[PDB]
Symmetry: D3
Subunit: 145 residues, 6 copies
Amino acid sequence: TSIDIEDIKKILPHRYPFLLVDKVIYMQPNKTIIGLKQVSTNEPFFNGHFPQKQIMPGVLQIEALAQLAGILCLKSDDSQKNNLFLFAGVDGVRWKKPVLPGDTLTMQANLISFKSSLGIAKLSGVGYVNGKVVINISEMTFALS
Amino acid sequence: DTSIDIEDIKKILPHRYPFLLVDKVIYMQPNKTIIGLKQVSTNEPFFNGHFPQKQIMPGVLQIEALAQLAGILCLKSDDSQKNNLFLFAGVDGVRWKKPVLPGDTLTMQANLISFKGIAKLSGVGYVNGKVVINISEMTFAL
Amino acid sequence: DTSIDIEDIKKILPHRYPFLLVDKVIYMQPNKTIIGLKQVSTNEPFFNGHFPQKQIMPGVLQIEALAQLAGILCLKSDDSQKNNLFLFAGVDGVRWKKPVLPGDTLTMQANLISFKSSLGIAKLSGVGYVNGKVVINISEMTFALS
Amino acid sequence: TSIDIEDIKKILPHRYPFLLVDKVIYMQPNKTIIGLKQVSTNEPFFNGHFPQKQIMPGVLQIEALAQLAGILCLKSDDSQKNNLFLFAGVDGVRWKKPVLPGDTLTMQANLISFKSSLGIAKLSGVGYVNGKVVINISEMTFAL
Amino acid sequence: DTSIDIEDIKKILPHRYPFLLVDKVIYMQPNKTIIGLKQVSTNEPFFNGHFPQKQIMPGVLQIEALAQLAGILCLKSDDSQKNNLFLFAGVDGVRWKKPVLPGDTLTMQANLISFKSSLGIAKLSGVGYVNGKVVINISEMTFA
Amino acid sequence: DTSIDIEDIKKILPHRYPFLLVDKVIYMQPNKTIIGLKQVSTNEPFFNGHFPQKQIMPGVLQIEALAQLAGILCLKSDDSQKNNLFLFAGVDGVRWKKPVLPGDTLTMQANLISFKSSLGIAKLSGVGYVNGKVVINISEMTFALS
Ligand SMILES: Oc1ccc(Cl)cc1Oc1ccc(Cl)c2cccnc12
Ligand SMILES: Oc1ccc(Cl)cc1Oc1ccc(Cl)c2cccnc12
Ligand SMILES: Oc1ccc(Cl)cc1Oc1ccc(Cl)c2cccnc12
């Protein structure tokens, strides 16, 4: 069930300058989510990372997947009417290639386990630019309090 | 031919944040045509103001994006005049067809018509092969 | 000759920072004309980028300022369509004569040409001045309302 | 004389978002300076002061006069080739009227005493909107 | 635990980003005294402009910070007047001793002098410290 | 004395606003350990978006902060490779215990595990505290030099 940005803002509480999901292109509740982040020079972090060379900070690639993963969780089960999800842990992150201004960051997050009893969700994540892997995440752990 | 990435764009244009609106130049033929792109993300400073309830890339910023791409072409076509500060002198026949939204890739093409430093150029911008903006004539001054 | 102060402009237009470019409306005649102003200060976020070595108000933002003023006139001339999100559909015959600089007061006048309850097609012309001298001309702004 | 924004930046080290003099319209070395700050909604402080009502922060009115004062000092005597001035004290500030988006803040600073390259300058300041007084400052004290 | 944290500060003050200059209120006594802090980081929007070559927290923003703290004390001391928009009406006897730099914790204390059941005028004094050392003094802040 | 603050940090790291997340280095021992701090204020540009209703310092930026402090250590431990652009190659075993809030002082310690200046491969561990209490743990940060 594809998606436009206004509806993302209804699901996630993130705003500027920390909303890092531009569009959700495919979603299957309780299973997988595919979305994208457009990487433009006209973004506030770029001036600091770095003046002489513009490279999207790896941590913000984590944040982007984590937000996409967080959308999946909130659509998969919103019985807990709390959209404030906090990152509890992340594991096995590997950055292969620099993400640069001009790139389309295509992202996929996959739900591993949900314990709606605690609020404990675990997800994996991969990000691509031009079909080539730029970031891998073995395991994102989330906790809505 | 060979890509002009963002670090090299900054060496041609004087524009900086928050008013550099060309992310990448993908093709250029001096004195003829230029193709580039602007990635449209929600994480841009203008989107909060246009509009809170619905994020739509301002039409005037699409003009600015094409104009900067057109400005690159001029400066690489003839840099005998060593001045990179090129002002907009006139624009004509602009038509916006479709809203440009967060998540889109704005693909842009500018075409040089006449160079004398009065340069005239035409411009088109696409999202998904669909035309979003047309510009008959951009006029620029040295 | 009812001025309009920034707070009431915000009630009409949906634009916010950093893209609201009308500071005050000084005169308005529904279905006819509107005069307002935009104060041009160095303390505006666009100036760092346009340009580092020389601050000049982006021509396009002069277009946007007139367009927003024009869009006020439209929404006060006829608000039966309770939609304040107006989109720019076309612009024609823009000519920039003089650079607009930090310190200037941009005085703006927009004039309604045609309005159609068609699908919300409004056409307007615009002129911007600094110190009584013309800095921007616009023959025709075309507005559509989603 | 006049002094543009490009030339202002040559004198003052202040940059965005803390340069609060747009134009210097009259200046007499060692005596008086008149300049202006254009107050627009399109300034970064206005979102925070305040969401429900945009009012230019008084402290920034102080800054603006102080920056204008600082220009006068640096053009009055630049033997000390240091443009980094610091505010050492301010006294007798009174805000009469709110300064709002749309206003032109016209500012005048008057040099009282200058003590060489000890570096102590004292100046007074007034700001106006529409010929009406918005801010008074009895004494700004600078370290050179 | 007579304190107030960021979220509850925002319930009291109308100030938002980039002009909210109180991070935490650590002690408060209605109608008497208030102690709070402002964390000073390089990651604040004003530092780019003040100054590119040397980051120093603008003195006027040290005035603002204390005044905001002072403003909290007023609003918690007497909220019968259900208006949280306090304007600075005057300030007097401000003296900056030492530069406040990125990395510092600005600890602030404001003390209520007079509150008028006649006017709507409050007068307060302020001191700001970094590492127990005095950085800013304010004899008198006047609020309406 | 071992005191390094923000002007000297900027000489070591290439990071600028809004992405320099180390305010002060309070202790450093080349090739071994580094201790520094980040002051957490409401007057930071990320807080508006994370989150409007509740200001909490994004976990990822806690990572970045420790990584930058780790990066200082590397560049002061061995600068034979005259390149200050360090990229994050991997991170492992991150756990966030407690929310970091406006008003907090984030105290940070990074410890060098292995350096192979041959390649440009450095591994480091990191811990962040607020009020002596652990807020973030990082088993392993891996950094490449390009
Ligand atoms: O926007 C502008 C409008 C009017 C002027 Cl006097 C200058 C402007 O800024 C520009 C500078 C340089 C280039 Cl190459 C531009 C290209 C297109 C549009 N504006 C440009
Ligand atoms: O700065 C200001 C100067 C003059 C005015 Cl008319 C208003 C100002 O903004 C403020 C509003 C409320 C409070 Cl409690 C303030 C506290 C300190 C500084 N400014 C404050
Ligand atoms: O605000 C400031 C307060 C304290 C310091 Cl240490 C510096 C400040 O910024 C300024 C720099 C230079 C000049 Cl000439 C100023 C003039 C007035 C106010 N602030 C000024």
